[PDB]
Amino acid sequence: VSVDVLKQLLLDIGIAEQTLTEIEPGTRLRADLGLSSVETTDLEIQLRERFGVRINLWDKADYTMEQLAVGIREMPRLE
Amino acid sequence: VSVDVLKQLLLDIGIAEQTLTEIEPGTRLRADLGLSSVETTDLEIQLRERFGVRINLWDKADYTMEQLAVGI
Numbered sequence: 001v002s003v004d005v006l007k008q009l010l011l012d013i014g015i016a017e018q019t020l021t022e023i024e025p026g027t028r029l030r031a032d033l034g035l036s037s038v039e040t041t042d043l044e045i046q047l048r049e050r051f052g053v054r055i056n057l058w059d060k061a062d063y064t065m066e067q068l069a070v071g072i073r074e075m076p077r078l079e
Numbered sequence: 080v081s082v083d084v085l086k087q088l089l090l091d092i093g094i095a096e097q098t099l100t101e102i103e104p105g106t107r108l109r110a111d112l113g114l115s116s117v118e119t120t121d122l123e124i125q126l127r128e129r130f131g132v133r134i135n136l137w138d139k140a141d142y143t144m145e146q147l148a149v150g151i
Contacts, residue, residue, distance in 0.1 A: 037129045045087050058091035058125055 001025070003065040005072055009050075013042045025066035029057070052077050080148050092121040104145040108136070126151065 007023050010033075019033060029035050035043070040057045047053040047068070052075040055063060086099050089112070098112055108114050114122070119136050126132040134150050136142065142150070 041084060041087055044091070045083055048087075054090075056091050058088075058129060 003027075003069045006065050006069050009046060010043070013039065013046055015039060023065060025064065025069075027065045028062045029064075029068075030062045047071075051075060080151055082144050082148075085144050085147060088122065088125060092118055092125055094118065102144060104143060106144045108142045108144075108147065110141055 003023060003025055007020055010020060011017060015033070015035070023033075027033060029040065029043070044055055044057060047055060051072050053068070053071040055068070055071070057063070082102060082104060086102050089099060090096060094112060094114070102112075106112065108119070123134065123136055126134055130151075132151050139146070
């Protein structure tokens with residue numbers, strides 16, 4: 001249900017907090033947040049390196065906050 | 080751009096993560112990573128369509144990750 005972890009990640013990579021005030025489970029990275037190419041690339045890097053989550057926004061057109069939150073909860077980690 | 084960014088762009092065109100472990104400034108596109116002609120072309124397309132960056136990766140015989148960053 002919760003997207004707080006992902007909201008904080010976005011904040012962590014430099015997304016402005018005013019862009020994030022209405023974030024919901026169905027909020028989409030491109031179509032709703034309007035994330036830039038550099039921002040999406042930074043997100044893919046940090047998802048992989050911090051959370052073990054591997055996504056490809058070159059290949060896939062978009063992802064919701066929910067799908068990414070769930071990925072984070074599900075992915076195996078050594079910690 | 081950093082080596083990290085280049086590594087992600089390469090992942091995103093389907094270069095295997097295993098092939099990218101130990102990637103660094105000196106790593107070469109063709110002689111070390113073994114990029115195919117189709118993969119090279121895919122990298123060009125991604126740079127142009129995702130970032131607005133036009134680069135011709137047949138202008139040189141090969142590119143280290145550092146030359147690629149500078150060229151970008």
